[PDB]
Amino acid sequence: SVLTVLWPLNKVGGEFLPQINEGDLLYMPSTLPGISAAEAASMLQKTDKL
Amino acid sequence: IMSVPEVARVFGKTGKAETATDSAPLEMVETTIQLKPQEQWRPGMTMDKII
Amino acid sequence: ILWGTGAGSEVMSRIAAPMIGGMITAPLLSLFIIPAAYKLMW
Amino acid sequence: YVIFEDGTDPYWARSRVLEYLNQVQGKLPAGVSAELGPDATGVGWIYEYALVDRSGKHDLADLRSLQDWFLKYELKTIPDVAEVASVGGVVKEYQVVIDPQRLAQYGISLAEVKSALDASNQEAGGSSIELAEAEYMVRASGYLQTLDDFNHIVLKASENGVPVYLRDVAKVQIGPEMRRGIAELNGEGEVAGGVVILRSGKNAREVIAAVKDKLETLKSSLPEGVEIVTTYDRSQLIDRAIDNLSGKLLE
Amino acid sequence: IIRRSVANRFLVLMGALFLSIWGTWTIINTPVDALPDLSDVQVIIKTSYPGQAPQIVENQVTYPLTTTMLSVPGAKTVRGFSQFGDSYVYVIFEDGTDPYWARSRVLEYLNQVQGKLPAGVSAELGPDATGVGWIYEYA
Amino acid sequence: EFIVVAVVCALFLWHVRSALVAIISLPLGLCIAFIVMHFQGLNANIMSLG
Amino acid sequence: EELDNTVRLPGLANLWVPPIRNRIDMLSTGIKSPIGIKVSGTVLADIDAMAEQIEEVARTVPGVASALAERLEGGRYINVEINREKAARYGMTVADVQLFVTSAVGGAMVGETVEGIARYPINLRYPQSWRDSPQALRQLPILTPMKQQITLADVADIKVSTGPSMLKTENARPTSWIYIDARDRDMVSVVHDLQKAIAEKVQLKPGTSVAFSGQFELLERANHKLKLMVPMTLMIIFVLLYLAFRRVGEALLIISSVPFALVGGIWLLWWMGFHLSVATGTGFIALAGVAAEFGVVMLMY
Amino acid sequence: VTSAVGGAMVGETVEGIARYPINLRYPQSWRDSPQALRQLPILTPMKQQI
Ligand SMILES: [Cu+]
Ligand SMILES: [Cu+]
C-alpha cells in the first residue's frame, strides 16, 4: 500500500504554493522601453475600454 | 625593526588611515609588528627581552 | 472548505486534503496495526 | 568625541548625537563634511592587509586606486564588517599649475580661472523629443576625461577671434595628491593597503574567516605582479587563546 | 495530577470567563488584513529629477546616494533603480529588524548626502507602509 | 463545523450537551491562540486565520 | 483567459496578477528567476561584454537555462557631444552651451509661484517648433556672449544612438544581474559545475567579480535547516513517545505507523486535483499529530 | 594664499564609480620659502602687478 503512495510522491503532480484570489485584477505587461507620453495616455484609454 | 630576527612581517602607518577612528597626524608613526611563531628562532629571549 | 470558496480557500484545501485522505487511512491503521505490531514486537 | 554613561544603548546613542548634526551642516564651508564615526570601537580593527606589487609594473598611485574602488567595495559586503579603511598610497590628482607670467600677460585673474574650471566638467539633459513614435532622450557631453581636454578650456575668448586656452596659462599634469597618511611594508617600500574594522560586538573570528575567503577568490581578478599580503590577523590570538584553554581543561 | 483542579470546579469556570470577557475583546478589537507583510524590511530612498537620463541620473544623484549608504549599519544590499527622471535606492536588513530602528539607521548618512547633490534634487525617505500598504484607491 | 461536529457526536452518543462541550472545547482554544499572536504582534492575515 | 485573449497588442506581453501580491511585487528588489548571476564591475563595458559570455555558457551547460545578459539597453537617445574647441572659439563655458540644452531645449523649471498653501511650477523653454526633431535641434539658435548668433551644430555634433533604458547596481558598483533558470529541479547541482566550467576556459577582466543569487541562495539555508530539524524533531519526539508506558517498543511502532496514514492522505490530493505545497506539508503535520494521538490512547487499551 | 600658495582642490573628475581630485596652484618655485613667498605675484583687479 505504501508503494502506491511512493508513485504519487515521486510524481507529485506539479506546482507549489497557491496563487490566491483577490476580488480584483491587476494588469501589468512586459512593455517596451521608449514610448511617447501621448501614445501612452492613448494606449491606456483604449486598454481601459477593451 | 626588520633586523630583529624574531619579527616576521612589519607594517608602517605614519598618519591617519581613512577611518574616523584613526586620528593620527603624520608624525604619528604606528607600525604593526607581526611576530614569528616561537619554535623559531631563539632560546632565552622572552617577549619582554624582545621589547 | 473543500468544495466551496467565497474568498481565500485555495490555501486551506492544500492543508486540508491530507487530513481527509489520511483520516480514512489513519483510523483503519489504528483498528488493525496496534495488535499485530504489539504481538509481533514480543 | 562625545561621551555617554556606561551601557547607554550604543545605537540609541549615536542617533541622539546626530540630532543636532543637521543644524550644523549649513554653518560650515563647502570643503567640509561632518562625518559620523564608523560603527566599531577602537577595539574593532581586525584584519590588516597590504597591497604589494611583485615587480614594478603596477604604479603606487595605481594601487591606492585599486584598493579604493575595487577592493574596499568587495570587502564592505561581508556581513559584520563595518567600514574598510584605506591606508597609504598616492591619490591620482589632476593638477593644473598656473604660471604668474602667463596670467599677467593675458590679464586673466585667478578668480577667472577658477570660475571656468568649475564651469567645464558637467553633464546635462533636456527632456525627450517625439521623433518617430518612441521618445528619444536628449543628453549632452561635458565631463572631463582627457588631459588634452583640460588644456582646451576657454578663458579669454574674443570674436573674429582667437581665444585663450588653459593650456596657455598652465601646465596640466597628473600628480600625487598631498599625502595625509603613508602606508609602508618593511624595506619592500611604500605600499597602500586597507584595514578591516568590526562593527561592534560580532565574532571577529567569523568575520575574518569570511574575509580570508573573499581575498582568496579575488587574487584571481588581481593584476599582474601584485598580491594581498596580510599585515595582521586578529584571528590568530583568538585561536591561540582558545586552543590553550581548551587543552587545559581536559588536562 | 489533573484531580487538583476538581476540588474547585468553580475556579476553572471563573478562570474560564476571565477568558470569556478577555477573549471577546482581544480577538475583536485587533487588526484584520488579507495576506502578511512580506515584501521584506527596507527603506525606500527616492530622489527626484525632472528630466535627464540614466547615465546622468545615476552619475549625478544615485551615485552620491548609493555610495554613502554602503557604510550604514545593517545594510545587506544597496541596490537601486536609476532611470529617466528618478532614482530609487532600496536598502535591505535581515528579517525582523525593528522597522523604525531600521529607517532611523539608514537616515544617518542621508544628511551627509544632501549637500552633494544638485538643487532640483531632494532625497526622499520612503513612506511608512510596505508595498502591501496600498488600500483604498479612489478616482 | 461546530454544529455538524455536534450533530455527529449526538448520533454517536444519542445526543448530549456535546455542543455545550464543543463551545467550551474549541472556542477557548481559539481564544488562547488569539491572545498569543497579540503577545508577539503579528497580523491577522488570512493564514493566521487559515 | 478571456481577458488575456481580449487585450492583445504589439510589444505587449500580458501578465495578470491580484492587487496585494502585485504591489508587493514591485518593491521587493528580488530576482524571481531561481538562479541569477550578479556580475560586479567597475565599468559597464566589462560587465556587459562579459554578460553575453554567460548567455552561451548557460545554454551549453546541461539545463534549460534561459540566459539574458540584459533586456535593459533599449532606450533611444540624442547625443549632443559638445565640441570644447569649437565652443572655445566663441568663448562659451560648456555650462552655457548646456543652458540651451537644458532650459531651452528641454525646460527645467526655474521657480514655483505661490497661491497660498499651493505651489505651481514655472517652465522656461524654446517653442515646440525648435524642439520638434534632431534637425530642428541641429539648428538650435544659440546667442553667444559676443552676440554672435549661431546654431547648436556649430558648437557640437548631435547624433542619434541607442542606449540604457535603466541602470541597476549592487552597492554603488554597476552589476548586471542575468536571469538564468530551469524549473522544478533543485538547481543546486547545476550551479557548481557551471561555476568551475566558466573558471576553466572563460576569463574575467581585471577589476571584476561575479556572484550568483535568486532562489538558489534560499534553499541551502531552508532545506539544510529543515533536514537538521528532522533529527531534532525526531529525537525530542522519541523521548516523548515512551513516556506514558515507559518502553521504546511502542515508540518504534508509532514511527512505522504514521507514514501509512500520510499515504492515505496524499492520495486524496490526486482525487480532488490539489497540488503539494508547504500547505500540504502543514496538512501532513496535522495528520501525523492526530494519528499519533490515537496510537498513544489506543496502545494503553 | 589659498589656491595659489597652497592648493585647495577646485573640483573632482569622474571616471565612473571613481573620483580623483583637481588641484590648482602656483608652481613649486614660488612656494619654496618665505622669501619666495614674500614675492608671490598678485595680479590686482586693475591689472596692477605686485
Ligand atoms: Cu597613535
Ligand atoms: Cu587643437
Side-chain angles (χ1 to χ4, degrees):
Chain A
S1 286
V2 153
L3 170 65
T4 204
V5 76
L6 282 186
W7 149 23
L9 279 197
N10 196 253
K11 213 71 174 184
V12 299
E15 274 86 344
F16 297 49
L17 274 78
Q19 225 254 319
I20 290 205
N21 178 320
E22 310 179 6
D24 319 63
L25 284 196
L26 267 272
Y27 175 156
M28 253 197 294
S30 308
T31 185
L32 289 204
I35 92 172
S36 325
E39 203 164 35
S42 157
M43 275 191 166
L44 173 73
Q45 193 170 50
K46 181 191 313 164
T47 277
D48 277 347
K49 292 178 178 182
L50 302 211
Chain B
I1 303 291
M2 207 39 178
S3 94
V4 162
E6 202 181 11
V7 309
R9 283 184 184 93
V10 173
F11 200 48
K13 192 214 61 169
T14 310
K16 54 207 87 164
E18 266 28 281
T19 270
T21 293
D22 197 357
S23 53
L26 223 76
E27 336 122 17
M28 250 254 185
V29 42
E30 165 177 355
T31 52
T32 258
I33 291 180
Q34 267 210 322
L35 265 175
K36 199 159 49 180
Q38 279 322 7
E39 39 203 289
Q40 324 183 349
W41 215 268
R42 238 54 164 232
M45 284 261 77
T46 104
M47 164 54 60
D48 272 64
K49 208 75 174 182
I50 308 326
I51 320 310
Chain C
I1 92 93
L2 231 350
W3 203 240
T5 167
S9 299
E10 306 83 355
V11 49
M12 294 185 301
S13 287
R14 323 266 177 253
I15 96 175
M19 253 87 311
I20 284 186
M23 211 73 171
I24 209 50
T25 258
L28 173 161
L29 152 141
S30 294
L31 324 172
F32 296 8
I33 81 164
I34 341 144
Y38 198 60
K39 71 176 189 174
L40 180 276
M41 188 50 54
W42 176 234
Chain D
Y1 294 107
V2 178
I3 341 286
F4 304 133
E5 277 79 13
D6 255 358
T8 47
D9 191 9
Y11 283 114
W12 133 280
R14 103 202 338 251
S15 186
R16 282 312 145 272
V17 167
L18 169 153
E19 230 88 281
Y20 301 83
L21 204 86
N22 88 64
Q23 281 94 105
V24 138
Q25 293 296 231
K27 316 194 181 191
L28 31 53
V32 248
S33 194
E35 305 248 323
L36 209 48
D39 198 338
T41 156
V43 148
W45 294 53
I46 307 180
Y47 197 59
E48 293 188 43
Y49 78 88
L51 210 317
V52 295
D53 64 324
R54 288 323 189 176
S55 88
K57 204 175 191 308
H58 268 291
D59 192 19
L60 196 181
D62 193 332
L63 291 160
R64 227 282 209 172
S65 275
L66 174 48
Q67 202 281 348
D68 270 320
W69 289 275
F70 155 79
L71 271 185
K72 170 160 189 165
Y73 282 42
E74 299 296 310
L75 274 41
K76 198 184 310 177
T77 321
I78 286 193
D80 293 352
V81 179
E83 69 162 346
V84 157
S86 306
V87 65
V90 142
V91 215
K92 176 178 174 172
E93 174 168 50
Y94 295 126
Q95 216 162 30
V96 177
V97 50
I98 306 295
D99 169 59
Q101 283 100 11
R102 287 307 172 261
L103 260 45
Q105 292 191 184
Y106 305 56
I108 52 186
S109 193
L110 262 179
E112 312 254 291
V113 190
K114 171 184 167 287
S115 290
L117 202 25
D118 296 29
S120 304
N121 185 30
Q122 335 158 64
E123 178 182 280
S127 177
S128 66
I129 39 200
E130 194 161 340
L131 171 68
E133 255 33 44
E135 291 186 80
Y136 298 55
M137 271 157 257
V138 148
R139 72 180 314 276
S141 167
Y143 277 117
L144 259 20
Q145 47 178 117
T146 21
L147 263 144
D148 159 78
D149 213 309
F150 269 95
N151 293 311
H152 283 35
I153 258 276
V154 93
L155 296 175
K156 205 54 201 143
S158 71
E159 63 289 83
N160 260 225
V162 265
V164 237
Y165 286 143
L166 196 157
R167 92 173 105 170
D168 294 353
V169 284
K171 150 178 281 297
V172 166
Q173 56 193 356
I174 287 177
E177 169 170 44
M178 160 178 157
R179 322 182 60 108
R180 36 189 148 66
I182 316 172
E184 169 169 50
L185 202 184
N186 304 179
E188 229 85 307
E190 198 154 296
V191 166
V195 10
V196 182
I197 284 186
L198 192 275
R199 189 260 251 31
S200 271
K202 282 166 160 298
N203 45 0
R205 178 276 279 185
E206 165 43 29
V207 160
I208 319 170
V211 170
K212 305 185 172 184
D213 198 356
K214 196 72 153 195
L215 295 186
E216 250 310 333
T217 320
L218 299 198
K219 295 203 168 196
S220 313
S221 308
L222 272 179
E224 263 39 48
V226 296
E227 310 146 341
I228 330 277
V229 348
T230 92
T231 272
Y232 170 115
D233 170 51
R234 167 81 70 79
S235 180
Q236 276 171 337
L237 174 43
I238 293 305
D239 293 338
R240 292 161 43 195
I242 265 57
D243 348 77
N244 156 109
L245 290 184
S246 276
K248 170 275 168 189
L249 265 155
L250 108 53
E251 164 265 69
Chain E
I1 293 76
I2 165 188
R3 282 159 51 200
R4 279 88 77 162
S5 66
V6 310
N8 40 11
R9 335 80 184 177
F10 57 91
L11 175 161
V12 285
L13 156 64
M14 49 207 47
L17 70 265
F18 284 126
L19 292 272
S20 173
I21 225 170
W22 146 312
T24 158
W25 269 277
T26 278
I27 146 201
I28 214 308
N29 292 46
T30 59
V32 66
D33 200 59
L35 298 279
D37 154 27
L38 226 315
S39 308
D40 44 10
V41 83
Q42 64 181 351
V43 189
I44 335 175
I45 301 182
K46 144 161 166 252
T47 276
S48 172
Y49 235 149
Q52 315 266 222
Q55 270 107 332
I56 173 265
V57 175
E58 252 224 358
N59 292 341
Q60 284 260 32
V61 21
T62 148
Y63 258 74
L65 217 52
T66 72
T67 292
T68 310
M69 285 295 158
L70 313 169
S71 183
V72 70
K76 201 155 41 62
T77 68
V78 173
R79 39 178 78 254
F81 314 155
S82 37
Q83 43 164 243
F84 184 100
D86 306 47
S87 150
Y88 302 117
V89 195
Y90 294 107
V91 178
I92 341 286
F93 304 133
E94 277 79 13
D95 255 358
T97 47
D98 191 9
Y100 283 114
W101 133 280
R103 103 202 338 251
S104 186
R105 282 312 145 272
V106 167
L107 169 153
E108 230 88 281
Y109 301 83
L110 204 86
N111 88 64
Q112 281 94 105
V113 138
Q114 293 296 231
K116 316 194 181 191
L117 31 53
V121 248
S122 194
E124 305 248 323
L125 209 48
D128 198 338
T130 156
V132 148
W134 294 53
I135 307 180
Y136 197 59
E137 293 188 43
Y138 78 88
Chain F
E1 184 59 3
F2 117 111
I3 139 266
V4 151
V5 161
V7 139
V8 159
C9 150
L11 308 197
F12 261 52
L13 263 68
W14 200 238
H15 108 321
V16 128
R17 315 338 206 267
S18 67
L20 199 356
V21 181
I23 218 294
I24 172 272
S25 106
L26 262 178
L28 302 221
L30 165 79
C31 298
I32 149 188
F34 282 157
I35 309 156
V36 58
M37 70 175 200
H38 224 50
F39 212 84
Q40 64 198 87
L42 293 188
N43 293 352
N45 47 18
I46 55 91
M47 287 162 321
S48 179
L49 319 179
Chain G
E1 175 195 19
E2 172 177 319
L3 280 288
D4 191 337
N5 200 351
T6 291
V7 172
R8 201 199 166 275
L9 267 135
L12 306 212
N14 317 1
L15 184 169
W16 301 64
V17 271
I20 284 70
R21 184 43 179 269
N22 180 211
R23 197 52 288 186
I24 267 173
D25 220 43
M26 299 205 280
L27 312 199
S28 47
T29 164
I31 304 84
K32 178 198 86 298
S33 297
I35 319 191
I37 299 187
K38 304 160 183 161
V39 47
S40 300
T42 288
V43 77
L44 217 304
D46 308 1
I47 76 194
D48 175 17
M50 293 334 206
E52 263 296 1
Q53 93 184 165
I54 270 186
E55 194 300 306
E56 84 175 55
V57 169
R59 202 88 151 188
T60 182
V61 58
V64 298
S66 180
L68 312 182
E70 84 303 325
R71 269 288 148 261
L72 290 166
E73 70 156 359
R76 270 250 110 172
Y77 284 154
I78 280 180
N79 296 130
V80 175
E81 312 265 315
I82 260 78
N83 205 4
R84 330 199 98 209
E85 194 174 44
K86 250 189 298 178
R89 287 161 63 258
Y90 294 46
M92 284 213 296
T93 48
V94 245
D96 216 324
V97 167
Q98 294 161 193
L99 183 26
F100 305 85
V101 134
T102 296
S103 290
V105 157
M109 139 198 145
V110 76
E112 287 196 308
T113 88
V114 268
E115 347 234 316
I117 186 204
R119 184 162 172 259
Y120 305 87
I122 293 175
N123 211 333
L124 175 98
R125 41 159 189 97
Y126 276 170
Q128 180 78 10
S129 306
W130 311 86
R131 324 179 305 171
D132 282 27
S133 55
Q135 200 59 28
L137 197 95
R138 289 201 185 42
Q139 300 158 350
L140 225 237
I142 284 80
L143 200 173
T144 317
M146 292 100 176
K147 226 61 42 55
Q148 312 174 110
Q149 190 164 17
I150 39 187
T151 53
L152 179 77
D154 292 41
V155 302
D157 317 332
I158 106 178
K159 310 163 303 173
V160 185
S161 74
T162 56
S165 168
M166 175 202 293
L167 280 43
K168 292 171 306 179
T169 61
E170 177 76 3
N171 308 9
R173 56 181 176 275
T175 90
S176 78
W177 329 329
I178 322 139
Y179 308 129
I180 28 61
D181 85 64
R183 280 323 315 262
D184 282 315
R185 207 317 187 274
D186 275 0
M187 315 106 321
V188 195
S189 314
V190 161
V191 314
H192 200 296
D193 58 325
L194 158 146
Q195 89 145 51
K196 272 208 161 193
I198 159 174
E200 289 171 344
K201 214 74 279 161
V202 334
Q203 291 145 319
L204 317 170
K205 290 213 72 59
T208 297
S209 71
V210 163
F212 321 84
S213 78
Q215 285 194 3
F216 164 68
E217 272 201 6
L218 173 53
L219 279 310
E220 288 194 353
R221 274 197 158 188
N223 180 316
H224 147 313
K225 203 66 174 183
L226 197 309
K227 285 281 201 306
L228 180 287
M229 290 312 165
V230 297
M232 281 292 188
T233 198
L234 291 193
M235 307 325 165
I236 177 61
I237 258 43
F238 166 67
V239 184
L240 290 145
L241 273 172
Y242 69 104
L243 89 170
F245 317 89
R246 157 182 157 263
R247 173 164 163 71
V248 2
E250 83 167 356
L252 163 175
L253 221 300
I254 139 257
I255 290 177
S256 186
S257 161
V258 35
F260 162 131
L262 297 183
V263 179
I266 146 194
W267 265 92
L268 171 56
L269 318 177
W270 279 217
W271 195 311
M272 284 186 167
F274 300 110
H275 286 310
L276 68 188
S277 69
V278 155
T280 78
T282 313
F284 279 17
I285 294 310
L287 179 176
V290 84
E293 181 279 338
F294 210 44
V296 154
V297 66
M298 202 52 215
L299 177 282
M300 214 318 150
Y301 290 147
Chain H
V1 134
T2 296
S3 290
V5 157
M9 139 198 145
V10 76
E12 287 196 308
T13 88
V14 268
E15 347 234 316
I17 186 204
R19 184 162 172 259
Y20 305 87
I22 293 175
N23 211 333
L24 175 98
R25 41 159 189 97
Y26 276 170
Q28 180 78 10
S29 306
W30 311 86
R31 324 179 305 171
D32 282 27
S33 55
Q35 200 59 28
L37 197 95
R38 289 201 185 42
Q39 300 158 350
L40 225 237
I42 284 80
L43 200 173
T44 317
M46 292 100 176
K47 226 61 42 55
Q48 312 174 110
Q49 190 164 17
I50 39 187

